[PDB]
Amino acid sequence: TENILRKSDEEIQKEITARVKALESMLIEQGILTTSMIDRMAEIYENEVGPHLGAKVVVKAWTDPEFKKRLLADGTEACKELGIGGLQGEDMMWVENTDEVHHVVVCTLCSCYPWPVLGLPPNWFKEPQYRSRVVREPRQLLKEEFGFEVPPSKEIKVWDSSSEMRFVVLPQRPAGTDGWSEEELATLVTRESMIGVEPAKAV
């Protein structure tokens, strides 16, 4: 949104860059930060940890009723069966979308997100626009922003991550996928479907 008081994006980036390099230089001198530590953290979240992990959990739940039960009972323990878990996903609670209920997650207080299964959150999830509105006008938000129309008669449950408990949505399995392999089913599971802002891919 326009703000006549705000500098250009270019000037903002230039200032931040200098401020971050300055702080970095100091933490490096303190011996608590190194170039390899920076590169390792970046590598993990750019190529190792991402939504493909959550997709694996979703497809297993879709194709294994017993695992699904365990997943809904204790998300952390269930995900550990697939070697999935860790930082910012120590406590996970998965919620199941059905014909009667639709779930959507948010961190109104900051940006809390299940890193182990979805990787780092997209910028819109961390921004004030989505965070402020989803708990108040979830139906309108889903329709206007994501083109996702949830019938008035269907309940929308919004989960606000105010604690360390991380909420993840288990989207409904799309129709016309009977007997599909886990690999094929995975192509329908998106980061958005696990946040609850969109359903899993149709067809």
Partner: protein, 226 residues
């Protein structure tokens, strides 16, 4: 604190800005900001709750429109100054130096295997906040409770939109680090945690969605039996 950052329910923030796709890190400075999280945590600058509080104390206008990772930088500086680990005057001098010489080198330093070990352990092992307490849970599933109207000036996880509102306990998760003490440098002081369900009508009145409910996590002191 009643900070602007507590945006749940706030009107007028505008439409969601959502590109079709985006990189995990939009610039090199973001990778640095991100990596400073485990670095400052290991160095004792702050714990998770304190980290959040530092961001909550930002200039609201700056918070609302600055790139996400800038919030992280602000909290590092805040706690660096608080603990006396960062000299503000030196930081300001170095900032100007890097403004004038953006391509100047970073300080010479030795790589440390222990820092890589810490990163791998934190990422794959996590930093669990669950704790065991001697007291049993005061509440249980089905209990109708009211959220506190207390308004601490320090850190807390009491979104203004749920204060004084009545809801139903959905699940008891066991005990966890208590933000009201931890975020204010007063220790873990673990408390039982519960997810509580609030109807949209309860939260927003007539303007609320007639078929919606919000689930919010409440530490034991936050709620009382109804």
């Amino acid at each position: 604190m009643n900070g602007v950052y507590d945006v749940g329910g706030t009107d007028g923030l505008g439409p969601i800005n959502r590109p079709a796709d985006e990189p995990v890190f939009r610039a090199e400075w973001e990778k640095v900001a991100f990596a400073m999280f485990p670095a400052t945590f290991r160095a004792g600058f702050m714990g998770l709750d304190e980290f959040r509080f530092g961001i909550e104390q930002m200039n609201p206008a700056e918070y609302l429109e600055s790139p996400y990772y800038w919030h992280w930088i602000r909290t590092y500086i805040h706690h660096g100054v608080r603990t006396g680990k960062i000299d503000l005057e030196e930081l300001e001098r170095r900032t100007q130096y890097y403004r004038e010489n953006p391509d100047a080198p970073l300080p010479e330093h030795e790589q440390k295997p222990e820092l890589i070990e810490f990163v791998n352990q934190a990422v794959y092992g996590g930093l669990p906040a669950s704790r065991e307490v001697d007291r049993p849970p005061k509440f249980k599933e089905g209990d109708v409770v009211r959220f506190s109207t207390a308004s601490p000036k320090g850190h807390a996880r009491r979104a203004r939109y749920v204060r004084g509102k009545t809801g139903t306990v959905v699940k008891h998760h066991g005990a966890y680090i208590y933000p009201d003490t931890a975020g204010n440098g007063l220790g873990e002081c673990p408390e039982h945690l519960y997810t509580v369900r609030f109807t949209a009508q309860e939260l927003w009145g007539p303007e609320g969605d007639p078929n919606s409910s919000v689930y919010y996590d409440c530490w034991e002191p936050y709620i009382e039996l109804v």
